[PDB]
């Protein structure tokens, strides 16, 4: 399973 | 900025003891996607941090199930069901919901264990260094507990001051002990003025002080 | 998976430094790549991130216009450039993404010339035996700045090693010891070589540690 994020990715 | 307050500052625990660390944020960590971005890290000295938990409660792959994370809003907790020797280090929480990203101040987890006496060793200066005009003598105290130890240098039975430096390792992740290295440094001219070089070690695991010594030229 | 950072740097006041973070074992473009400062003895301070999927950056206001963050997706490598360095910028710098942290890059801001270490044996003898074991080591003396790396037997020896924190000598140069405990029985058949690397001076030294007769 891919790791969970630390924090949300930014929008594009 | 959102401030992350961690308590306690230090946890002193025995093997097998449960442990709990609190992280409180100054503002809610709920993000607009419904997730709460709260991470826990463990750092060992001279090593990098390692992530243990993300999204408040989700253990990373390979992290033992003795670790659990809980909380919501502003109040978060990392618990260890039973502490093992390898759990020592500095724990940090950090929040991923707000800008700037911010970290707690850290909680240092240290292991208490039985008293262990040092193994004591001494090393004369090398011919290579003597050729350069200096003499360093090293006294080594290996794998002792607690960290407090006294090293006294003596030269022809005269107590030295002012010509030595020492340093202590971090606590060991397997046996929870410390080690210490002390270096006495003299010019070659001063070194050759004396015969007996000794280090005397006092430690709670020793029934009386231990002296290691050598005679210059013989050793 | 892993993040591999570039080696330690000595840089002059007012100059700039560029360091790298090579990623493997997770999707580099799917997670923010963070950079984090640690002054030794202290906590962690966030500098900024780049998201490699689209290049977007976000910074701590303290570091805006000081730090530049980039990401090369063809090589899965992130970079941080810090400009106008001052004494307060000497620190370890980490990259961090997904479940991983890099091992840190130590930056020393100083106008002093680099100096490589001298390496002296800590020879085993009847005065360095305890309970049938023997200790031996290397004294790594008179270098600047930190760090040195010490391995033993080209990395084939790791058990029983203590590489101590360096001390600062009154000359302003560092000194450290690295020691190992081994069987006394095999000092005549085994070879012990300490391998010392000091990147800022491009110095490598291998020193064979042989027993004393005493």
Numbering used by the authors:
A (entry chain P): 2 to 13
B (entry chain L): 1 to 27, 27A, 27B, 27C, 27D, 27E, 28 to 214
C (entry chain H): 2 to 52, 52A, 53 to 82, 82A, 82B, 82C, 83 to 95, 101 to 216
Task: Provide the publication's sentences verbatim.
Our crystal structures revealed that more van der Waals contacts were formed by a Pro residue in the PPPP and NPND motifs compared to an Ala at the same position in the PAPP and NAND motifs. Consequently, the epitopes of the NAND, NPND and Mixed peptides had a slightly greater buried surface area (BSA; 753, 762, and 765 Å2, respectively) than the PAPP peptide (743 Å2), which only consists of Ala-containing motifs. Similarly, Pro6 of the NPND motif in the NPND and Mixed peptides makes additional interactions with antibody residue K.Leu50 that are not present for Ala6 of the NAND motif within the PAPP and NAND peptides.
Circumsporozoite protein (CSP) is the most abundant protein on the surface of Plasmodium sporozoites, and is necessary for parasite development in mosquitoes and establishment of infection in host liver cells. Similarly, the central domain of PbCSP contains an array of PPPP and PAPP motifs interspersed with NPND or NAND motifs. Importantly, the central region of CSP is highly immunodominant and antibodies targeting the repeats can inhibit sporozoite infectivity by preventing parasite migration and attachment to hepatocytes.
